[PDB]
Short mmCIF file of C-alpha atoms and ligand atoms in Angstrom, two decimals:
data_model
loop_
_atom_site.label_atom_id
_atom_site.label_comp_id
_atom_site.label_asym_id
_atom_site.label_seq_id
_atom_site.Cartn_x
_atom_site.Cartn_y
_atom_site.Cartn_z
CA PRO A 1 -8.13 -21.40 -106.88
CA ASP A 2 -6.99 -24.83 -108.61
CA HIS A 3 -3.38 -23.59 -108.59
CA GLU A 4 -1.65 -21.90 -105.83
CA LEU A 5 1.15 -19.35 -106.22
CA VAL A 6 4.22 -19.87 -104.09
CA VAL A 7 6.84 -17.13 -104.00
CA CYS A 8 9.92 -16.35 -101.95
CA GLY A 9 13.23 -14.76 -102.01
CA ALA A 10 16.43 -13.92 -100.25
CA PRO A 11 19.37 -11.64 -100.60
CA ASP A 12 21.61 -13.93 -102.71
CA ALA A 13 21.91 -17.42 -104.02
CA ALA A 14 23.32 -19.14 -101.00
CA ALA A 15 20.59 -17.66 -98.76
CA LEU A 16 17.89 -18.63 -101.34
CA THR A 17 19.21 -22.25 -101.28
CA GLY A 18 18.86 -22.25 -97.46
CA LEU A 19 15.30 -20.95 -97.51
CA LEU A 20 14.16 -23.16 -100.34
CA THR A 21 15.46 -26.13 -98.42
CA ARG A 22 13.45 -25.16 -95.42
CA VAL A 23 10.32 -24.53 -97.40
CA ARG A 24 10.71 -27.97 -99.13
CA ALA A 25 10.90 -29.51 -95.57
CA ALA A 26 7.92 -27.61 -94.47
CA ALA A 27 5.78 -28.46 -97.49
CA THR A 28 6.12 -32.22 -97.51
CA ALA A 29 2.65 -33.50 -96.54
CA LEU A 30 0.74 -30.20 -96.01
CA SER A 31 -2.97 -30.25 -96.73
CA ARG A 32 -4.31 -27.93 -99.40
CA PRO A 33 -5.57 -25.49 -96.83
CA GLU A 34 -2.16 -25.56 -94.98
CA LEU A 35 -0.43 -25.04 -98.44
CA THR A 36 -2.64 -21.89 -98.94
CA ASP A 37 -1.65 -20.57 -95.56
CA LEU A 38 1.97 -21.17 -96.14
CA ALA A 39 1.73 -19.54 -99.67
CA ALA A 40 -0.22 -16.52 -98.29
CA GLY A 41 2.38 -16.12 -95.51
CA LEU A 42 5.31 -16.20 -97.94
CA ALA A 43 3.73 -13.66 -100.25
CA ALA A 44 3.22 -11.29 -97.30
CA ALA A 45 6.77 -11.69 -96.03
CA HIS A 46 8.62 -11.76 -99.54
CA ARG A 47 7.64 -8.49 -101.17
CA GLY A 48 9.55 -5.31 -102.00
CA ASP A 49 13.23 -5.49 -102.81
CA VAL A 50 13.82 -9.25 -102.84
CA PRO A 51 17.10 -9.68 -104.59
CA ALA A 52 17.03 -13.49 -105.51
CA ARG A 53 13.48 -14.93 -106.42
CA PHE A 54 11.66 -18.17 -106.69
CA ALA A 55 8.04 -18.44 -107.77
CA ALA A 56 5.98 -21.51 -108.84
CA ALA A 57 2.36 -22.19 -109.65
CA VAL A 58 1.38 -25.52 -108.13
CA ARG A 59 -1.55 -27.77 -107.82
CA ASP A 60 -0.77 -29.11 -104.46
CA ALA A 61 2.04 -29.73 -101.90
CA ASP A 62 3.87 -32.40 -103.87
CA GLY A 63 4.01 -30.14 -106.88
CA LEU A 64 5.54 -27.58 -104.67
CA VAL A 65 8.17 -30.13 -103.43
CA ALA A 66 8.86 -31.03 -107.07
CA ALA A 67 9.34 -27.41 -107.99
CA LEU A 68 11.58 -26.79 -105.14
CA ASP A 69 13.68 -29.84 -106.02
CA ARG A 70 14.20 -28.38 -109.55
CA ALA A 71 15.13 -25.07 -108.20
CA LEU A 72 17.62 -26.45 -105.66
CA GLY A 73 19.24 -28.64 -108.31
CA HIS A 74 19.64 -25.67 -110.45
CA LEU A 75 21.23 -23.45 -107.77
CA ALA A 76 23.45 -26.50 -106.73
CA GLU A 77 24.90 -26.49 -110.31
CA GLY A 78 25.47 -22.81 -110.03
CA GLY A 79 22.43 -21.92 -112.20
CA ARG A 80 21.04 -18.40 -111.77
CA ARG A 81 18.13 -18.34 -114.23
CA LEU A 82 15.43 -21.29 -114.66
CA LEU A 83 12.37 -20.14 -116.74
CA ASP A 84 10.05 -23.04 -117.41
CA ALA A 85 6.81 -21.33 -118.53
CA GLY A 86 5.21 -24.77 -119.32
CA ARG A 87 5.72 -25.87 -115.88
CA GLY A 88 4.95 -22.48 -114.18
CA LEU A 89 8.39 -22.53 -112.45
CA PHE A 90 10.57 -19.44 -112.41
CA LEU A 91 13.91 -18.80 -110.60
CA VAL A 92 16.06 -15.66 -111.08
CA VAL A 93 19.18 -14.68 -109.19
CA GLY A 94 20.63 -11.33 -110.42
CA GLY A 95 17.33 -10.00 -112.06
CA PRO A 96 15.29 -8.08 -112.96
CA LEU A 97 14.90 -9.44 -116.38
CA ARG A 98 13.17 -7.71 -119.28
CA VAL A 99 9.53 -8.59 -119.51
CA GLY A 100 7.34 -7.84 -122.66
CA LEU A 101 3.57 -8.05 -122.88
CA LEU A 102 1.54 -10.00 -125.56
CA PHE A 103 -2.01 -8.97 -126.29
CA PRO A 104 -3.91 -11.57 -128.26
CA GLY A 105 -6.52 -11.39 -131.03
CA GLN A 106 -9.21 -13.57 -132.05
CA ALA A 107 -8.72 -17.54 -131.96
CA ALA A 108 -7.85 -19.09 -135.30
CA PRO A 109 -9.54 -22.50 -135.25
CA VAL A 110 -8.72 -25.23 -137.87
CA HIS A 111 -11.61 -26.06 -140.21
CA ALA A 112 -11.64 -29.94 -139.81
CA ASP A 113 -8.97 -30.71 -137.27
CA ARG A 114 -8.24 -34.39 -137.67
CA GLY A 115 -8.60 -37.07 -136.54
CA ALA A 116 -7.87 -40.66 -137.62
CA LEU A 117 -5.43 -38.91 -137.61
CA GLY A 118 -4.93 -37.28 -140.91
CA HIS A 119 -2.12 -39.84 -140.84
CA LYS A 120 -18.95 -31.66 -138.77
CA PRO A 121 -16.41 -28.68 -139.22
CA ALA A 122 -15.44 -26.19 -136.52
CA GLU A 123 -17.63 -23.18 -136.40
CA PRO A 124 -15.91 -19.84 -137.30
CA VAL A 125 -15.51 -17.28 -134.34
CA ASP A 126 -18.58 -14.86 -134.46
CA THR A 127 -16.31 -11.88 -134.73
CA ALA A 128 -18.97 -9.16 -133.79
CA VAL A 129 -19.31 -10.98 -130.41
CA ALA A 130 -15.76 -12.24 -130.10
CA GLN A 131 -13.83 -8.87 -130.61
CA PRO A 132 -15.28 -6.95 -127.69
CA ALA A 133 -15.25 -10.09 -125.40
CA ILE A 134 -11.55 -10.65 -126.07
CA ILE A 135 -10.85 -6.89 -125.50
CA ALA A 136 -12.79 -6.86 -122.27
CA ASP A 137 -10.73 -9.86 -120.88
CA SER A 138 -7.47 -8.07 -122.04
CA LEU A 139 -8.56 -4.85 -120.24
CA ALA A 140 -9.13 -6.99 -117.04
CA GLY A 141 -5.67 -8.22 -117.48
CA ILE A 142 -4.37 -4.84 -117.69
CA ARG A 143 -6.19 -3.85 -114.48
CA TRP A 144 -4.37 -6.85 -112.87
CA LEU A 145 -1.03 -5.67 -114.11
CA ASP A 146 -2.04 -2.16 -112.73
CA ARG A 147 -2.90 -3.64 -109.33
CA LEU A 148 0.62 -5.33 -109.31
CA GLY A 149 2.42 -2.19 -110.48
CA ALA A 150 3.96 -4.08 -113.40
CA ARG A 151 6.92 -2.71 -115.23
CA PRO A 152 7.31 -4.44 -118.73
CA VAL A 153 9.53 -3.02 -121.24
CA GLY A 154 7.02 -2.83 -123.94
CA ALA A 155 4.02 -4.67 -125.59
CA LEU A 156 2.68 -5.94 -128.77
CA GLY A 157 -0.78 -6.96 -129.94
CA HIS A 158 -1.79 -9.41 -132.66
CA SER A 159 -4.43 -7.93 -134.94
CA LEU A 160 -7.18 -7.05 -132.50
CA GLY A 161 -4.74 -7.05 -129.62
CA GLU A 162 -2.93 -3.98 -130.98
CA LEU A 163 -6.13 -2.10 -129.63
CA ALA A 164 -5.49 -3.44 -126.06
CA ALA A 165 -1.68 -2.70 -126.47
CA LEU A 166 -2.40 0.87 -127.35
CA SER A 167 -4.84 1.16 -124.31
CA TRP A 168 -2.03 -0.33 -122.06
CA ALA A 169 0.22 2.28 -123.58
CA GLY A 170 -2.07 5.16 -122.63
CA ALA A 171 -3.35 6.03 -126.18
CA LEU A 172 -7.03 5.36 -125.44
CA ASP A 173 -8.90 4.67 -122.26
CA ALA A 174 -10.52 1.31 -121.53
CA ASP A 175 -14.09 2.45 -122.17
CA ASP A 176 -13.21 3.92 -125.68
CA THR A 177 -11.03 0.84 -126.38
CA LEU A 178 -14.00 -1.51 -125.73
CA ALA A 179 -16.34 0.68 -127.70
CA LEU A 180 -13.86 0.65 -130.64
CA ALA A 181 -13.58 -3.20 -130.31
CA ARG A 182 -17.50 -3.55 -130.70
CA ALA A 183 -17.43 -1.35 -133.80
CA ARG A 184 -14.49 -3.14 -135.29
CA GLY A 185 -16.07 -6.60 -134.78
CA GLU A 186 -19.33 -5.28 -136.17
CA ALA A 187 -17.58 -3.85 -139.40
CA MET A 188 -15.52 -7.04 -139.78
CA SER A 189 -18.47 -9.45 -139.45
CA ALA A 190 -20.00 -8.05 -142.81
CA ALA A 191 -19.72 -10.62 -145.55
CA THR A 192 -16.96 -10.29 -147.99
CA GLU A 193 -17.95 -9.70 -151.69
CA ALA A 194 -17.52 -13.36 -152.49
CA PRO A 195 -16.85 -16.42 -150.39
CA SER A 196 -13.43 -16.19 -148.85
CA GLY A 197 -11.25 -17.54 -146.09
CA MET A 198 -7.81 -18.34 -144.70
CA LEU A 199 -5.20 -21.17 -145.14
CA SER A 200 -2.44 -21.80 -142.76
CA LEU A 201 0.96 -22.92 -143.96
CA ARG A 202 3.86 -24.67 -142.14
CA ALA A 203 6.43 -22.59 -143.98
CA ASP A 204 8.08 -19.33 -143.76
CA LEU A 205 7.24 -15.89 -145.40
CA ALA A 206 9.27 -16.49 -148.64
CA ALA A 207 7.87 -19.99 -149.16
CA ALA A 208 4.32 -18.66 -148.56
CA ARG A 209 4.93 -15.94 -151.05
CA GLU A 210 6.34 -18.34 -153.67
CA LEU A 211 3.16 -20.66 -153.13
CA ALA A 212 0.86 -17.56 -153.42
CA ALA A 213 2.59 -15.97 -156.38
CA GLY A 214 0.17 -15.37 -159.35
CA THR A 215 -2.62 -17.15 -157.37
CA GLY A 216 -4.51 -14.10 -155.97
CA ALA A 217 -4.09 -15.16 -152.46
CA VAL A 218 -2.02 -12.78 -150.17
CA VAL A 219 -0.18 -13.12 -146.93
CA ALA A 220 -2.48 -12.39 -144.02
CA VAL A 221 -0.61 -13.35 -140.99
CA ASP A 222 3.26 -13.74 -140.61
CA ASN A 223 3.54 -15.58 -137.33
CA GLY A 224 7.13 -16.82 -137.78
CA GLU A 225 9.40 -19.07 -139.68
CA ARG A 226 7.05 -22.09 -139.11
CA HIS A 227 3.62 -20.40 -139.60
CA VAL A 228 2.37 -17.98 -142.19
CA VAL A 229 -1.38 -17.63 -143.00
CA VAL A 230 -2.66 -16.67 -146.49
CA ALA A 231 -6.09 -15.42 -147.46
CA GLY A 232 -8.29 -14.82 -150.45
CA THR A 233 -11.40 -16.03 -152.32
CA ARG A 234 -12.10 -19.82 -152.28
CA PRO A 235 -10.68 -20.18 -155.74
CA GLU A 236 -7.46 -18.41 -154.82
CA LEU A 237 -7.03 -20.52 -151.75
CA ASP A 238 -7.52 -23.66 -153.74
CA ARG A 239 -4.60 -22.66 -156.09
CA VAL A 240 -2.37 -22.15 -153.03
CA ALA A 241 -3.47 -25.66 -151.51
CA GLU A 242 -2.53 -27.31 -154.87
CA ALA A 243 0.72 -25.56 -155.00
CA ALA A 244 1.46 -26.43 -151.37
CA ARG A 245 0.76 -30.11 -151.95
CA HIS A 246 3.05 -30.18 -154.99
CA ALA A 247 5.83 -28.49 -153.02
CA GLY A 248 5.32 -30.83 -150.09
CA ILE A 249 4.32 -27.89 -147.79
CA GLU A 250 1.26 -28.62 -145.26
CA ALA A 251 -1.61 -26.30 -145.85
CA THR A 252 -4.35 -26.23 -143.17
CA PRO A 253 -7.80 -24.71 -143.99
CA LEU A 254 -8.98 -22.46 -141.12
CA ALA A 255 -12.59 -22.17 -139.88
CA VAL A 256 -13.34 -18.66 -140.92
CA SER A 257 -15.71 -17.22 -143.54
CA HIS A 258 -13.59 -14.02 -144.17
CA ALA A 259 -10.25 -13.41 -145.78
CA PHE A 260 -9.12 -11.29 -142.85
CA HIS A 261 -5.99 -9.31 -143.38
CA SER A 262 -6.55 -9.04 -147.08
CA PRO A 263 -7.97 -6.51 -149.56
CA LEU A 264 -11.44 -8.13 -149.25
CA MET A 265 -11.58 -6.28 -145.82
CA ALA A 266 -11.31 -2.87 -147.44
CA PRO A 267 -15.18 -2.16 -146.84
CA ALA A 268 -14.75 -3.06 -143.19
CA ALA A 269 -11.76 -0.70 -142.95
CA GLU A 270 -13.97 2.23 -144.24
CA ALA A 271 -16.51 1.66 -141.48
CA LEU A 272 -13.71 1.30 -138.91
CA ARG A 273 -12.34 4.65 -139.98
CA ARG A 274 -15.65 6.24 -138.96
CA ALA A 275 -15.60 4.81 -135.48
CA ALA A 276 -11.88 5.58 -134.93
CA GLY A 277 -11.82 9.00 -136.06
CA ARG A 278 -14.33 10.07 -133.40
CA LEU A 279 -12.18 9.17 -130.55
CA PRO A 280 -9.75 11.26 -128.36
CA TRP A 281 -6.50 9.49 -129.24
CA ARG A 282 -3.40 10.32 -127.30
CA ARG A 283 0.31 9.58 -128.07
CA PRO A 284 1.34 6.22 -126.60
CA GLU A 285 3.40 6.67 -123.47
CA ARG A 286 4.93 3.24 -123.29
CA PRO A 287 6.62 1.15 -126.12
CA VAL A 288 4.43 -0.70 -128.49
CA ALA A 289 5.83 -3.04 -131.30
CA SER A 290 3.25 -2.69 -134.11
CA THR A 291 2.05 -5.71 -135.96
CA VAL A 292 0.74 -3.31 -138.60
CA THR A 293 4.09 -1.50 -139.29
CA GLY A 294 6.46 -4.17 -137.90
CA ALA A 295 8.22 -1.19 -136.21
CA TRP A 296 8.00 0.66 -132.95
CA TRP A 297 5.02 3.04 -132.71
CA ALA A 298 6.42 6.57 -133.08
CA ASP A 299 4.42 9.49 -134.28
CA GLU A 300 1.79 7.52 -136.12
CA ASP A 301 -1.79 8.54 -136.88
CA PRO A 302 -3.67 5.76 -135.08
CA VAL A 303 -6.70 6.13 -137.32
CA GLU A 304 -4.54 5.51 -140.43
CA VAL A 305 -2.74 2.54 -138.86
CA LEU A 306 -5.82 0.83 -137.46
CA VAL A 307 -7.57 1.30 -140.84
CA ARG A 308 -4.66 -0.28 -142.97
CA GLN A 309 -4.40 -3.04 -140.22
CA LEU A 310 -7.41 -4.57 -141.70
CA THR A 311 -6.29 -4.97 -145.28
CA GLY A 312 -2.53 -5.57 -144.67
CA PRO A 313 -0.77 -8.46 -143.10
CA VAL A 314 -0.15 -9.11 -139.31
CA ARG A 315 3.49 -8.60 -138.78
CA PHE A 316 3.86 -10.74 -135.57
CA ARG A 317 7.30 -12.15 -136.50
CA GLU A 318 8.74 -8.63 -136.97
CA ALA A 319 7.07 -7.06 -133.95
CA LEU A 320 8.10 -9.99 -131.67
CA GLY A 321 11.68 -9.67 -132.98
CA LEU A 322 11.73 -6.04 -131.99
CA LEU A 323 10.48 -6.70 -128.35
CA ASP A 324 13.84 -7.52 -126.53
CA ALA A 325 12.62 -9.50 -123.54
CA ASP A 326 13.72 -12.53 -121.68
CA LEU A 327 10.25 -13.36 -120.81
CA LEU A 328 6.84 -12.50 -122.38
CA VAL A 329 3.57 -12.52 -120.50
CA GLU A 330 0.26 -12.77 -122.38
CA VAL A 331 -2.46 -10.47 -121.16
CA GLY A 332 -5.82 -11.59 -122.46
CA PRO A 333 -7.88 -14.85 -122.68
CA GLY A 334 -6.34 -18.01 -123.74
CA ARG A 335 -2.72 -18.69 -124.74
CA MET A 336 -2.77 -18.04 -128.49
CA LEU A 337 0.19 -15.77 -128.46
CA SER A 338 2.29 -17.57 -125.84
CA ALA A 339 1.98 -20.72 -128.20
CA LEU A 340 3.10 -18.44 -131.15
CA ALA A 341 5.98 -17.05 -129.21
CA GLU A 342 7.10 -20.40 -128.16
CA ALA A 343 6.95 -21.54 -131.73
CA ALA A 344 9.55 -18.72 -132.39
CA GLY A 345 11.80 -19.91 -129.63
CA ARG A 346 10.83 -17.34 -127.09
CA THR A 347 9.76 -17.90 -123.46
CA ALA A 348 6.13 -17.03 -122.88
CA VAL A 349 3.39 -17.67 -120.45
CA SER A 350 -0.34 -16.45 -120.43
CA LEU A 351 -2.23 -14.93 -117.60
CA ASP A 352 -5.36 -16.43 -119.38
CA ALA A 353 -7.56 -13.52 -118.11
CA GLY A 354 -11.19 -14.42 -117.50
CA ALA A 355 -10.59 -18.21 -117.30
CA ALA A 356 -12.39 -20.75 -115.11
CA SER A 357 -8.91 -22.12 -114.14
CA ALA A 358 -6.50 -19.89 -112.08
CA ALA A 359 -3.63 -21.88 -113.79
CA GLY A 360 -2.79 -18.83 -116.00
CA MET A 361 -3.17 -16.16 -113.42
CA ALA A 362 -0.81 -18.01 -111.07
CA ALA A 363 1.70 -18.97 -113.63
CA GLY A 364 1.80 -15.56 -115.18
CA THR A 365 1.96 -13.74 -111.85
CA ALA A 366 4.85 -16.06 -110.78
CA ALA A 367 6.64 -15.27 -114.01
CA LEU A 368 6.13 -11.36 -113.24
CA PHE A 369 7.33 -11.74 -109.64
CA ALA A 370 10.50 -13.94 -110.37
CA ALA A 371 11.42 -11.75 -113.38
CA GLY A 372 11.29 -8.68 -111.07
CA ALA A 373 8.51 -6.91 -113.04
CA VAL A 374 6.26 -6.98 -109.89
CA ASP A 375 7.34 -6.60 -106.26
CA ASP A 376 4.31 -7.99 -104.39
CA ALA A 377 2.33 -11.29 -105.06
CA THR A 378 -0.24 -10.56 -102.25
CA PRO A 379 -3.03 -9.59 -104.69
CA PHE A 380 -3.20 -13.35 -105.67
CA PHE A 381 -4.41 -13.98 -102.08
CA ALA A 382 -6.94 -11.27 -101.70
CA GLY A 383 -10.79 -11.57 -101.98
CA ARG A 384 -11.07 -15.48 -102.32
CL1 LIG B 1 6.08 -8.78 -145.98
#
């Protein structure tokens, strides 16, 4: 792999300082094959009940020395918790912390991302192909969490990702979930009655609703205080874009040919109802914060919730606010949701399941280990 995972631990902060000092000494100058042997040995020896924990995803020995330096500086100032998701460096004395899962949906590309600088368009996602592809990668991430014995406090899924969150929670098995994803992407790829799309606003929900009022456009995705997506026909979207320019709000056209998460998806919701109603649904056994209801999943009829998902807004701001977690780990391809969570001031890292680069699997597994959600990082060293 292009990133290595280096974990260790000790019984308390003083003992971890001593160990980290010695690993720093040992690490200076190691070749890449020597660093892999040191990292595989540390993972074998530091598993189980490991009270005070360090984990870092690193490109090479010098990156390990740099991470150790940061951890040691933190402990020297009496720090007991350093969570730097964007550097893949995690240190926790006195955990476990609360870890939540994020299950992504489909990518949301910008139509003409500029440029020179703003200051041929992107192609929309082919949703009939993308939805089952993303859910297959999410289900592979759930198999990694299962191999690790991960113990998150709960999960949420954005739009499509709610299917993977429910599968993780035991409501539906992996084969049925992938089959339902193929049906959902086929239903949602049908053309809308008239040309339609989505418009991203750098504004909050109230500001979006003020811009959209009387226009025909509606809120499609509430991603937080800094990001709300509206949807409608092209005339409706043009009304909002005019309003947004007058108000001084930045409106970004997205590369999509459907007003997803609007009433124009009602035909697709009917077709999804047929596919969903044929499946052997079970009650979820683990907590799921729904981006359909913006509430915890309780006694809900999954067919009704997944059908109204398509016409109603994605309540990611509300669902994320419910999930009380010191650290979030995204389980799926890419880092869409970790970026949205970071924009809400949360700490998040993606496993980036199915990626060419091992960057995400190393950083995400370092996060699970340091936060105490997994006890054994040896699976990262198996089967190379
Ligand atoms: Cl609302």
